[PDB]
Amino acid sequence: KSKLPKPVQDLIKMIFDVESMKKAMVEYEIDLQKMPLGKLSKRQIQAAYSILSEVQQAVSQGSSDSQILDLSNRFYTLIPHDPPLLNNADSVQAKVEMLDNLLDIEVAYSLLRGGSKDPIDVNYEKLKTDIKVVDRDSEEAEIIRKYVKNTHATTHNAYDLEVIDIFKIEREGECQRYKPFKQLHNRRLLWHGSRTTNFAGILSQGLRIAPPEAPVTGYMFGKGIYFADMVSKSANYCHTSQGDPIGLILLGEVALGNMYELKHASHISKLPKGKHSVKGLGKTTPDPSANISLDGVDVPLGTGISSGVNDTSLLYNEYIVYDIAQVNLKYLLKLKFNFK
Ligand SMILES: NC(=O)c1cc(F)cc2c1C(=O)N(C1CCN(C3CCC(F)(F)CC3)CC1)C2
């Protein structure tokens, strides 16, 4: 049996569930016959990003129907489906999203196949990630639950949110990596939602930035790591429905430094001198007054009020850093989405 607390065990079971890895591949219409879980590779997914960039190159340079046809055939040969022609940005970005997921799904599966005590404990160790349970009645839980209740958006009213488990997390190497970036202040505790099938990869390797091979557009603020101060904006990237009421989310410590504050999409080739992050400005913001501190870290847990920011792409804020070392992952939440 396992020495880990039941909540930690149930987390490992959820993160390394091989069924749900398969299920999402079916959802993406991958031919599991032509390509099962075992046959996914980094090199395969890498070249598929490159084909997608080539599609976008062609579309912008307005290539001929057969040149676009050739490229789609190459893509669907590299990633066999059970299909949409890739001729516009929207279909290309749909495929990026898939590859991002599959990239993580591959990482999760490579972990189980590696290595030689309960399987649960052996798995936990492959994560190189300290996971401890935060007690329901603790100070951390009171603040976290308030952060959740208060930063739930009014337009995200298709579900109610309930915190089931809260975990203190410490990724191996991350602290040594993060230390120098504490020098810039404006450190804040922020949300990052993702698919459950991604979390094995997220804990093994932390939050990573898009690979250079991937196509450049689709990204509002370039290739960086993206955060929210409203819980539900991040909760939407959990992609949970009826069959999955359980999602996972991260609270991370982000060292924002001097924020380059924007209202419209820009392709951040380079941050301006003395700027260390980007903040997209929403129509709705957490109350600036109600900001709280937790262990030297600012927590924007105020009820979302109307910010006077007009003529902006975004309804809610978002934060983006461009060095992976600027993130320190602190908490992992398990959430029940209670639908209606
Ligand atoms: N992860 C988050 O919680 C999050 C929070 C935010 F406030 C904003 C964002 C995220 C998040 O994950 N974001 C991603 C969502 C996916 N986009 C792009 C979608 C189009 C693409 F072409 F596939 C490139 C990737 C990149 C940013 C934005």
Curated annotation (Swiss-Prot):
Domain of life: Eukaryota
Annotated effect of mutating residue 52 to F: Leads to constitutive activity in absence of DNA damage due to unfolding of the PARP alpha-helical domain, relieving autoinhibition
Annotated consequence of substituting residue 316 to H: 14% of wild-type activity and increased branching 15-fold
Outcome following mutation: residue 238 to R: <0.5% of wild-type activity
Domain PARP catalytic: 118-340
Localization: Cytoplasm
Mutagenesis / variant outcome for changing residue 227 to S: 10% of wild-type activity
Active-site feature positions: 318
Outcome of substituting residue 256 to F: 1.5% of wild-type activity
Its biological purpose: Promotes AIFM1-mediated apoptosis. This form, which translocates into the cytoplasm following cleavage by caspase-3 (CASP3) and caspase-7 (CASP7) in response to apoptosis, is auto-poly-ADP-ribosylated and serves as a poly-ADP-ribose carrier to induce AIFM1-mediated apoptosis.
Protein name (record): Poly [ADP-ribose] polymerase 1, processed C-terminus
Lineage: Eukaryota, Metazoa, Chordata, Craniata, Vertebrata
Span within the parent record: 662 to 1010 of 1014
